[PDB]
Nucleic acid binder design. Structure first.
Ligand SMILES: [Mn+2]
Ligand SMILES: [Mn+2]
Ligand code: NA
Ligand code: NA
Length: 327
DNA sequence: CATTAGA
DNA sequence: TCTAATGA
């Protein structure tokens, strides 16, 4: 956590680089189990060899470790860090919709800068166009103060359309968060569950309304169950307009709402921990259900959930408020 | 790990 | 159809 820190750190620098600038999934995969491993190690690693003893760590990485130990640096990281090509690939990648592969390609063509990307808006798909469009607005955190107004709105229109819709703004906002990166609304309806062969309109009506009133101003992708876009708060009485924000809305078979909600509410760790616990408790938990366990090794048979509680109750735990699902 | 865009 | 990019 702090003992092997630089180690795992330089290791991640490395991995990350293989995978993005290079297309070496393998080495990239190497650097990672290793970092995964040197991370678990309970002692200060003093040299390659000591590390080396570890599974995943070979001679190549061990060699990195010595130089890194002997000098608080590494040439390859120093070389990479300098590499404009590589820098470039790193940066483009930030644009929403630009992945490594495309990052690679643009570079090839010679588009390294934001402005490059601009003179070439033609070569970008819609997603990336939008990503290019709100580049600044997307990199900003979402002050809670705003999350509240946004949530306020989404809720209202939702209710305005069907009275029967249930919405929940999940995420860190759900958990207290002073700010968030985007907004995740999970939604469901009574007339939509595991069986009852869809009703795409469910998602659609809603998107439509939010759009109607000008909440959503752009579409990243809209399927029949996962809508992904951009919203904005009505930029009041001038002088101050609101930054463009990412928003995701996803339909959920009401019969799996709570699990889902439970899940996306997080945090990553409270989750795992809870998950690890349901296990002992003779259970199973994933983003949609909770199945009681069985001795033959495994079992199925989805228990009925009516609220975050049922789940809690199942694994016989203390209801933990969102605020405290921190870990 | 599953969902959408695109080509 | 597959391959990319988001997500969480
Ligand atoms: Mn989120
Ligand atoms: Mn999101
Ligand atoms: Na080894
Ligand atoms: Na990106």
């Amino acid at each position: 956590e702090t003992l092997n820190g630089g180690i795992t750190d330089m290791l991640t620098e490395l991995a990350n680089f293989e995978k993005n600038v290079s297309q070496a999934i393998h080495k990239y995969n190497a650097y990672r189990k290793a970092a995964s491993v040197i991370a678990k190690y309970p002692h200060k690693i003093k040299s390659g060899a000591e590390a080396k003893k570890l599974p995943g760590v070979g001679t190549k990485i061990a060699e990195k470790i010595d130089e890194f130990l002997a000098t608080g640096k590494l040439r390859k990281l120093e070389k990479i860090r300098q590499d404009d090509t590589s820098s470039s690939i790193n940066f483009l990648t930030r644009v929403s919709g630009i992945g490594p592969s495309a990052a690679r390609k643009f570079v090839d063509e010679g588009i390294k800068t934001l402005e490059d990307l601009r003179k070439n808006e033609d070569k970008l798909n819609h997603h990336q166009r939008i990503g290019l469009k709100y580049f600044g607005d997307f990199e900003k955190r979402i002050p809670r103060e705003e999350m509240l107004q946004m949530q306020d709105i989404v809720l209202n229109e939702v209710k305005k359309v069907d009275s029967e819709y249930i919405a929940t703004v999940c995420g860190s906002f759900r958990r207290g968060a002073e700010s968030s990166g985007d907004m995740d609304v999970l939604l469901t309806h009574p007339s939509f569950t595991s069986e009852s062969t869809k009703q795409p309109k469910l998602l659609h009506q809603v998107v439509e309304q939010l759009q109607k009133v000008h909440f959503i101003t752009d579409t990243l992708s809209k399927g029949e169950t996962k809508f992904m876009g951009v919203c904005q708060l009505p930029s009041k009485n001038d002088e101050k307009e609101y930054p463009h924000r990412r928003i995701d809305i996803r339909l959920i078979p009401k019969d799996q709402y709570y699990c889902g909600v439970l899940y996306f509410t997080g945090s990553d760790i409270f989750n795992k921990n809870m998950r690890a616990h349901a296990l002992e408790k003779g259970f199973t938990i994933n983003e949609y259900t909770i199945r009681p366990l069985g001795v033959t090794g495994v079992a199925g048979e989805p228990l009925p959930v009516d609220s975050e509680k049922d789940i809690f109750d199942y694994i016989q735990w203390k209801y933990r408020e969102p605020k405290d699902r921190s870990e």
